[PDB]
Ligand binder design. Structure first.
Ligand SMILES: O[C@@H]1[C@H](O)[C@@H](O)OC[C@@H]1O
Ligand SMILES: [Mg+2]
Ligand code: NA
Ligand code: NA
Lengths: 211, 210
């Protein structure tokens, strides 16, 4: 969840907002170790319930999200349903555990490609065009993350937009991401420079992957 | 002496506007068939399966014409080569259908078949069904027969399945055409066409458009 003012400005300038609970357990093995564990349901529920209690009056908020990269566990399903009961007015999405689980109203993959399948076991990333028509699938598809804009990037961005406009159920996506997470350091002369992972003695680090 | 007056054009021609040579004549086989007064007038074969196709039921509905008699029977027997795998015999008189009763002139035979050899284009396993119309005490009135392929065609969850497996149709449209004989078909040409299709990895054909 964002600084309360963010929503106010989105209400007034006009932007559609995905409001997202503060839950990410990426580093767990497997990803859903905590989110499938009922002992972690109370801590997760407060991260979802208190967000909704806070932001439910903002028109700019159109979709609720259960969090980020935490696999898919029973706690997601429980909290999915909680929001659906309390607020029928907004869809719920969640990308974890394959982007098309029972905890999501929207097929919301990250970095699924336009035409090329990535058939990872258990959590494949299908071609977004293919994903739509998988036997029994009916939901819309909006990429929660796509076109990873790291350094000299956004190659093939136009391939996405051609597909979005041609397919009714391909309804776009959210680029990853808006602003580089570089920090300011100063040299011996007081001259500012842009720093990334490791420049603060922080170790282990992931270098420029913050940008 | 037979006399046949064939018209090139009729109101039927309004429903025969296929993209092809427009011809006319007696272009398929003519024949004479002798059926007894008491006769098999129709018969339908169905095959249904359990979930993994390890059990089937062959269901044959047989219709008669002629005078109804208590001594009348139908036997449907199922043959795999020279081995009889299944058989059933019953008098005429189907189950009750509505307030007025049932079909006294029909009977349905149900034969159990364990581990049936399934039909497909990959392996065209066939059985032989023989439909005998006869007296209870053993006099055959007549027999009809057909080739039976055990297979299930269904659409499930958006997929066309044959025997539980999604098909991939390597098909072709095929008109009935011969450069010398026009629209008259013969065995040799037919067999030739099929051998070339299968040799070229086709598994399906569409009867375009008749
Ligand atoms: O006329 C043929 C066919 O019957 C039609 O459907 O498509 C064109 C083809 O040449
Ligand atoms: Mg035509
Ligand atoms: Na679209
Ligand atoms: Na990053």
């Amino acid at each position: 969840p964002n600084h309360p003012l963010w929503y106010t400005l989105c209400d007034r300038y006009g932007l559609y907002v995905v409001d997202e609970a503060n839950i990410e357990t990426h580093g767990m093995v497997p990803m859903n170790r905590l989110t499938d564990d009922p002992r972690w349901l109370p801590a997760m529920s407060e991260r979802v319930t208190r967000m909704v209690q806070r932001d439910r009056n903002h028109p700019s908020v159109i979709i609720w999200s259960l969090g980020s990269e935490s696999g898919h566990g029973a706690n997601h399903d429980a909290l999915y349903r909680w929001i659906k009961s309390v607020d029928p007015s907004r869809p719920v999405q969640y990308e974890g555990g394959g982007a098309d689980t029972t905890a999501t109203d929207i097929i919301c993959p990250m970095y699924a490609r336009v035409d090329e399948d990535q058939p990872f076991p258990a959590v494949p990333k299908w071609s977004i065009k293919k994903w739509l028509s998988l036997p029994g699938e009916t939901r819309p598809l909006i990429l929660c993350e796509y076109a990873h804009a790291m350094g000299n990037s956004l190659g093939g961005f136009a391939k996405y937009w051609q597909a979005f406009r041609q397919y009714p159920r391909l309804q776009g996506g959210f680029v990853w991401d808006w602003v580089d997470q570089s920090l300011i350091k100063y040299d011996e002369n007081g001259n500012p420079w842009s720093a990334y992972g490791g420049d603060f003695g922080d170790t282990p680090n992931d270098r420029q992957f913050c940008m | 002496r037979l006399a046949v007056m064939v018209l090139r054009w009729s109101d039927g021609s309004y429903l025969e506007d296929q993209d092809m040579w427009r011809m006319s004549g007696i272009f398929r086989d003519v024949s004479l068939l002798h059926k007894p007064t008491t006769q098999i007038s129709d018969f339908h074969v169905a095959t249904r399966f359990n979930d993994d196709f390890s059990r089937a039921v062959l269901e044959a509905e047989v219709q008669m014409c002629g005078e109804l008699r208590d001594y009348l029977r139908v036997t449907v027997s199922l043959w795999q080569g020279e081995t009889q795998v299944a058989s059933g015999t019953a008098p005429f008189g189907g189950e009750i259908i509505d307030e007025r009763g049932g079909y006294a002139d029909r009977v349905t035979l149900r034969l159990n078949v364990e581990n049936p050899k399934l039909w497909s284009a990959e392996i065209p396993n066939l059985y032989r069904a023989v439909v005998e119309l006869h007296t209870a005490d053993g006099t055959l009135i007549e027999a009809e027969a057909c080739d039976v392929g055990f297979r299930e065609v269904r659409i499930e969850n958006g997929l066309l399945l044959l025997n539980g497996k999604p098909l991939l149709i390597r098909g072709v449209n095929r008109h009935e055409h011969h450069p010398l004989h026009g629209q008259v078909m013969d065995e040799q040409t037919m067999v030739q066409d099929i051998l070339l299709m299968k040799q070229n990895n086709f598994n399906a054909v569409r009867c375009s458009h008749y």
